[PDB]
Write a protein that binds this ligand. Structure first.
Ligand code: GLC
Ligand code: CA
Ligand code: CA
Length: 651
């Protein structure tokens, strides 16, 4: 008996890592309950009985509706589950919701989790960081269909095996954002400032695949609202696509199950529209935006035949894909045990000067790709250090934290895509002109924790946040998880462990830098009726946003910008509320399968005009300052960043 049905495009939701707390001694209360649908009906163990708020003769009071639990004793709570009514009737199904924890039952504080649950009969979960509590409260903000009622067939609360208070100075995890989909792919859509999330659909528990369906949702940081899941017949089964945000700011998704399809996200109408078909079938490949705004892609797993997966280029202006057969994929293949099926997967691509694209790995061999004529490829040497040659690092990460100096930090990964041990390998690559072999050195003493399928983002201050993953790569399995994130600080050539989280983020997980300076980490799974589909995300707040007291630090503010669009080499003048010491530009990102070829950081050279007025010039080379949308951050002497000001860079 699987969860849900094909009719609803259902998937089993992942539970927290813990056990259900005995409810025999619980005292429950609700804002209202119809006779016959008492509040204790949600804790009687009968899936066919449910609590239901007032209706009919008692009137139809609208939400919010609340369910409060007194567990009588303190427990280390890390989640809750909600089983909706199972009679086919949808009245009362909870949509938008919030979860609160309390030690006294009177001070509930702020929600430990909030978001929106999908409208179907499957068991829903709200998983969050462990916290001692005697009382738990679930608030239904809206009903799945906008109706006045709230109902619950069974509600449970989970306890972790232990609790350890977070250490001061190492950041903080929370809250959890509950979603109606597994965010397997995501991006920060620049025109709206929202986190766009999407996934494909498949569930062998039902069989008979629908075909070409894309499920999408979004989270707005300014309102905290998670939009309802949308089902689009894109005729593009993604699952393992390439993703880029072009020079104009449009999200371009390529290949996957439907190997030659291209889908574009039209931001003005919040919808996926068809793009031109690629010339070659590809899956698990990376794509990268170029200095001229075009998008380059190479690799594509294996296909029944003898068609090579050499490079090709997309033009947003002519809406065409053109093969670049001489931009050969062979030089970048790893020695994966599975051969061509995996050897060209997830290349560490970076658009660079004069239409070139640098490939930093995962293969030991690094290469330069060219896009003039029918393409070209030139060796850039091997990723290495005084410690030796770096081994193939499939699903390791690569982040360009200082584009002006050509700095790329690489870390983690394993020799084979699956069933192999990850390593602590980490390197710093310093890019020069196309065609030259960059110098490479080891980053500090490597990662604290070996990991693969982990994700990462460059932060406003130039540091790189690294999170999730597992010690041994096993897609869809939440084994050997790494719960402690790490931050690399370049000026100190040092890695720092941060406070750990409670949710496993492995294969199919993502991370993105939010405009407000925090990190959005979520997803993982997408395996039908499996127990590892994570329908959520969590926020990580870096230490730079907290003062010594534990409260939010005062942030510098950008009170004015002379323009919001500038050509490469151009100048922008700004005004701040107080003196600042540094500034940076971070390109908006996209993410899936550990790949993010869109993010990068440019340290800005400031000019002090006095009176808290500063100006800066955007790098003249579009290979460094890739066209598209960027986030402008200013930092004070204490290292605290402002929230981002959106800037569009053009040619
Ligand atoms: O600069 C000090 C810092 C980074 O750093 C990590 C932790 O937060 C500390
Ligand atoms: Ca019941
Ligand atoms: Ca929009």
């Amino acid at each position: 008996i699987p969860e849900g049905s094909l009719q609803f495009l259902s998937l089993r939701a992942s539970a927290p890592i813990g056990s259900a707390i005995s409810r025999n001694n619980w005292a429950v209360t609700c804002d209202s309950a119809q006779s016959g649908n008492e509040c204790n009906k949600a804790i009687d163990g009968n899936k066919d009985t449910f609590w239901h708020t007032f209706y009919g003769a008692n009137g139809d009071p609208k939400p919010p509706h609340t369910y409060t639990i007194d567990m009588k004793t303190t427990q280390n709570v890390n989640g809750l589950s909600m089983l909706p009514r199972q009679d086919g009737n949808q009245n009362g199904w909870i949509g938008r919701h919030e979860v609160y924890l309390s030690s006294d039952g009177t001070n509930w504080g702020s929600p430990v989790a909030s978001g929106s649950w999908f409208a179907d009969s499957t068991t829903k979960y709200s998983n969050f960081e462990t916290r001692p509590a005697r009382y738990v409260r679930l608030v239904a903000i809206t009903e799945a269909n906008g109706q006045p009622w709230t109902s619950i067939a069974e509600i449970n609360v989970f306890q972790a095996s232990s609790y350890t208070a977070p250490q001061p100075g190492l950041g903080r995890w929370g809250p959890t954002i509950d979603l109606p989909i597994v965010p397997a792919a995501a991006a920060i859509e620049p025109t709206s400032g929202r986190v766009l999330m999407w996934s494909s659909y498949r569930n062998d528990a039902f069989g008979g695949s629908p075909g070409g369906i894309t499920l999408t949702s979004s989270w707005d940081p300014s309102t905290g609202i998670v939009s309802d899941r949308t089902v689009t017949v894109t005729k593009h089964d993604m699952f393992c696509p390439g993703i880029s945000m072009d020079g104009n700011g449009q999200i371009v998704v390529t290949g996957g199950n439907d190997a030659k399809k291209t889908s574009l996200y039209d931001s003005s109408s919040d919808s996926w529209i068809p793009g031109p078909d690629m010339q070659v079938a590809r899956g698990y490949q990376s794509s990268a935006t170029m200095s001229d705004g075009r998008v380059f892609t190479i690799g594509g797993s294996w296909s029944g035949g003898v068609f090579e997966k050499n490079g090709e280029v997309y033009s947003p202006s002519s809406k065409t894909w053109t093969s670049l057969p001489n931009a050969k994929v062979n030089p970048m293949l790893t020695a994966d045990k599975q051969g061509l099926y995996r050897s060209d997967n997830h290349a560490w691509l970076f658009g660079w000067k004069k239409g070139s694209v640098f490939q930093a790995g995962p293969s030991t061999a690094m290469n330069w790709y060219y896009t003039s004529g029918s393409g070209d490829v030139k060796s850039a040497g091997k990723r290495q250090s005084n410690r030796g040659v770096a081994p193939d690092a499939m699903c390791g990460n690569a982040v360009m934290y200082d584009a002006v100096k050509g700095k790329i930090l690489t870390f983690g990964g394993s020799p084979d895509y699956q069933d192999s041990d990850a390593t602590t390998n980490a390197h710093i690559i310093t890019l020069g002109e196309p065609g030259t072999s960059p110098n490479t050195v080891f980053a500090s003493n490597g990662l604290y924790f070996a990991r693969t399928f982990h994700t990462s983002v460059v932060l406003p201050d130039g540091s790189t946040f690294i999170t999730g993953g597992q010690r041994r790569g096993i897609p869809f399995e939440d084994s050997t998880p790494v719960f402690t994130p790490e931050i690399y600080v370049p000026e100190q050539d040092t890695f720092y462990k941060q406070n750990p989280n409670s949710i496993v983020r492995v294969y199919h997980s993502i991370s993105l830098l939010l405009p407000d300076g925090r990190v959005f980490n979520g997803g993982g799974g997408l395996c039908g009726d499996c127990t590892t589909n994570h329908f959520d995300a969590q926020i990580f707040t870096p230490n730079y946003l907290y003062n010594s007291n534990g409260n939010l630090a005062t942030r510098p503010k950008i009170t004015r910008t002379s323009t919001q669009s500038v050509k490469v080499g151009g100048r922008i003048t700004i005004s701040t509320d107080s003196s600042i010491s540094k500034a940076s530009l971070i390109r908006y990102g996209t993410a899936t399968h550990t790949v993010n070829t869109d993010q990068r950081r440019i340290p800005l050279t400031l000019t002090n005009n006095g009176g808290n007025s500063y100006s800066f010039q955007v790098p003249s080379d579009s290979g460094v300052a890739l066209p598209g949308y960027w986030m402008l951050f200013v930092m004070n002497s204490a290292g605290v960043p402002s929230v981002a000001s959106t800037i569009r860079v053009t040619q």
